[PDB]
């Protein structure tokens, strides 16, 4: 899938300065070109510039000349980029790749904005007592008020994988709002649980939700 | 800068056709063109370098061709996970540039979605607020409406939507909807709908519940 390994995801005010890491793991870091690359959302890729470890060369796209600054450190076979007096035009996946083979970064998503950090509510979605008794049953999490980017959200701590479709979050305001679904036989449940899991480190916060059928 | 236009910009076909995407550039570039593939919320993956040599591990339905400004990207049989986004480069002159992408969906027997409605969880009604989540789910094609009803009239403000990417499994496609409100508001009213009109049917699914029971 994956080969290089970069830094993890940025929230940093306008007019400051990010540092992404690109970790490139082999004996021969300073023979192979690291490309950088910009995609935001709706856009497509737009190329940043290279660098070769060890030569002192370096190209930058004449569009991100003051806005990029490349470095390398041969002896951790580590390439970092520097981005600059950010704005929200900033705000958008990164990614690295070897110029050779499929080599690529899993990318890195930075997000320009002075909005506060704001941990998640994390609500139940059980089916209304009009419970229609077809063979599956469908389940969610609403995942509400939260910034930034990103939750990860989980079902039984990873066990339950098929039938889960966790939406892209929206941004209405400063607040990101996101739903998981998941559908499951209909005898299992409620007998055996299920149970939402959504992590927000930038908030340093996780919440575990039992769903649970509605009382009354 | 050179540009680099891809043909078509999005493009739908089905398992085992032959598929066929054009990359040209506004200036020659003496075969120096790459083709990446993206999927959705993954990163770009290298298919094919210098025209039409594949990278390692690649499998042999693709193919690349061209010279000068007219570049192709071949499939000769395709698969579903060949779904995705499509991207070419050219590195002939800096700065680099890519094309701004084929976006490529596979072709798949209708269905309708599978919808389910939700009442705002006694949780958030604690907070005062009242989100009512509607799921379609597993739904082909892509298009779709959903319109909510507050006692039989129709609602738009407060409503918000997320759309799923193609899924990898069954190439269908799913849709979640959340009409939030006040804790007053949701109080005062009695009738909450969502319907969802797909290609599949003239006649709305529609979901629904009554605030009085639990
Ligand atoms: O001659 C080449 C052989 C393999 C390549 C693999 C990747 C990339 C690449 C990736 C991201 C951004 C720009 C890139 C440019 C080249 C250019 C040549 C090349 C390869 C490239």
Redesign the interface.
Known sequence: ??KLHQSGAELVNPGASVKISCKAPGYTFNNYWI?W?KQRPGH????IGEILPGSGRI?Y???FKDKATFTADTSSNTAYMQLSSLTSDDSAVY?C?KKY???????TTVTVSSAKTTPP?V????????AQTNSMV?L?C?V?GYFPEPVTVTWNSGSLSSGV?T????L?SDLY???S?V?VPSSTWPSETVTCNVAHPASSTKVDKKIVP??? | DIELTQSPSSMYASLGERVTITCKASQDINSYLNWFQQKPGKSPKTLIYHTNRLVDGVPSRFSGSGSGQDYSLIISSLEFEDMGIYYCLQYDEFPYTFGGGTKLELKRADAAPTVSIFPPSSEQLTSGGASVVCFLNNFYPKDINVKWKIDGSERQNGVLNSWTDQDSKDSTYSMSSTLTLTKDEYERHNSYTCEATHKTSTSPIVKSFNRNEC
């Open positions: 899938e994956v490309e690359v497509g890729l737009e190329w190209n796209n004449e569009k990614y790749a083979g499929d080599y690529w970064g899993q990318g509510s609500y139940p979605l059980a089916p209304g007592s009009a469908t969610g609403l509400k479709h939406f892209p979050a929206v209405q709002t996101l739903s679904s559908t509605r009382d009354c």
